[PDB]
Amino acid sequence: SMQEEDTFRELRIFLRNVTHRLAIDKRFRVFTKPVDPDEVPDYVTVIKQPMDLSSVISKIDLHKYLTVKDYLRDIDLICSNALEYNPDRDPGDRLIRHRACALRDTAYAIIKEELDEDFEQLCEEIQESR
């Protein structure tokens, strides 16, 4: 069953290309790093499960994502954290909230247009078999 490892290799490579495209985008630079504890001291008191695109790239290489659902759960976590933390008052707040939705939508859009359904389905079935 190297075919299962080839499937997981192929998945990781895909997910790296997607995460790369998001990380090089100027809009999502704020989501490439963890939140600055010194600049945003109350962030940790709101968000208990932080996520960013550096963490995602690390988890890809550690084999934490066996399915696209697993990957997109962390993408969603990045967005929901941003919408959970930031209020809807100042224009800086609205800029970041909008970028977070944009990050999520962009990820889902790329995957929808480039991921073969039968390949996604394969990965889902391999992890259930384990």
Binding site: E39, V40, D42, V46, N86, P87, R89, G92, D93, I96
Partner: peptide
């Protein structure tokens, strides 16, 4: 700080 960055 209160909520919001910057």
């Amino acid at each position: 700080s209160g909520r919001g960055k910057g």
